[PDB]
Amino acid sequence: GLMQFTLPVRLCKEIELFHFDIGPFENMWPGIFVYMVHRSCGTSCFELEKLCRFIMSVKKNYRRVPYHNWKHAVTVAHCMYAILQNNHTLFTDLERKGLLIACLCHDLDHRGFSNSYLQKFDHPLAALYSTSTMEQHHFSQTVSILQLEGHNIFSTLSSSEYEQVLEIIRKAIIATDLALYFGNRKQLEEMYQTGSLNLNNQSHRDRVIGLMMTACDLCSVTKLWPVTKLTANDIYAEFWAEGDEMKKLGIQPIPMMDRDKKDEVPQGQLGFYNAVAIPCYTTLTQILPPTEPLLKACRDNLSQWEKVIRGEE
Ligand SMILES: Cn1cc(-c2ccccc2)nc1COc1nc2ccccc2nc1Cl
Ligand SMILES: [Mg+2]
Ligand SMILES: [Zn+2]
């Protein structure tokens, strides 16, 4: 009850900033997450023993892949923490509870392969879940862990609060399917500019939480340049392995996944900042003005990729 987590001074200050990097010490990531729940939600939100058992079972169900790993889970939860802390009064008690957990769980048991690769492979998960294949699996793995003995962190909620939080988590996790982001953002763009955006309309909140989820999930583009640039190596290590696996099925992969086309990465990052990241953080900033540092950091990183193309690095 009286047991705070406390971080060293540099981490205590920097964890509050959007561009915080959780560092290379894996054993500190659980404590960093509990710290964020305790400040975001409260020391009362979860029984510490249950929360600790939940976190360690979640960790165990992330795989040793280059990018879609336990570090990504905690990184995406920290971005959500910074959004929630900068928008104190906009979110319900249940939302603060659900969203940090949703972010920690959002890529559970990822294999380092896209929905496309599973469908082309004819993976069993592609027959069980015809759209948002991996994201339905990530939600399925979250419910599994919540149902293990001693892992039910929501046990003090009523039946209908419990149903609501699990529905916040399902929609949050489904929204991390980038195929769904383009339409979600166009609708938010229209709603904001015709003035119809209403945060009391549940279906509107759902859309805004979905964009928050895209923003947290892509947050590697919002770090200081050396973090962004080194994370890009991990992202492409997966893409290129998928490309190899497409070539094994007798399919020329897209260039983004073809390691023979490494030279075109700087131009591919440009397209992604312009087509995905910038539009994402721009619409997020219009809806939630205090998230503007994410858009500013993304813009700085776009400018760094422009310098790479110009051979200035
Ligand atoms: C779109 N695109 C095309 C290329 C390309 C590269 C080499 C050769 C030919 C084409 N690279 C990208 C970059 O793509 C992404 N970067 C991400 C960065 C961070 C977090 C999620 C991301 N998700 C995606 Cl999909
Ligand atoms: Mg994912
Ligand atoms: Zn993710």
Swiss-Prot record:
Places the protein is found: Cytoplasm, Cytosol
Annotated 3',5'-cyclic AMP binding sites: H68, Q269
Residues binding a divalent metal cation 2: D107
Residues annotated as domain PDEase: 1-312
Active-site residues per Swiss-Prot or TrEMBL entry: H68 (proton donor)
Ligand binding (3',5'-cyclic GMP): H68, Q269
Residues holding a divalent metal cation 1: H72, H106, D107, D217
Tissue expression as described in the entry: Abundant in the putamen and caudate nucleus regions of brain and testis, moderately expressed in the thyroid gland, pituitary gland, thalamus and cerebellum.
Signal peptide (from-to): none
Domain characteristics, as noted in the entry: The tandem GAF domains bind cAMP, and regulate enzyme activity. The binding of cAMP stimulates enzyme activity.
Protein family membership: Belongs to the cyclic nucleotide phosphodiesterase family.
Subunit structure: Homodimer.
Function: Plays a role in signal transduction by regulating the intracellular concentration of cyclic nucleotides. Can hydrolyze both cAMP and cGMP, but has higher affinity for cAMP and is more efficient with cAMP as substrate. May play a critical role in regulating cAMP and cGMP levels in the striatum, a region of the brain that contributes to the control of movement and cognition.
Illness association: Dyskinesia, limb and orofacial, infantile-onset: An autosomal recessive, early-onset hyperkinetic movement disorder characterized by axial hypotonia, dyskinesia of the limbs and trunk, orofacial dyskinesia, drooling, and dysarthria. The severity of the hyperkinesis is variable. Striatal degeneration, autosomal dominant 2: An autosomal dominant disorder characterized by striatal degeneration and dysfunction of basal ganglia, resulting in hyperkinesis.
Protein name (record): cAMP and cAMP-inhibited cGMP 3',5'-cyclic phosphodiesterase 10A
Organism from which the protein derives: Homo sapiens (Human)
Residue window of the full protein shown: 724 to 1036 of 1055
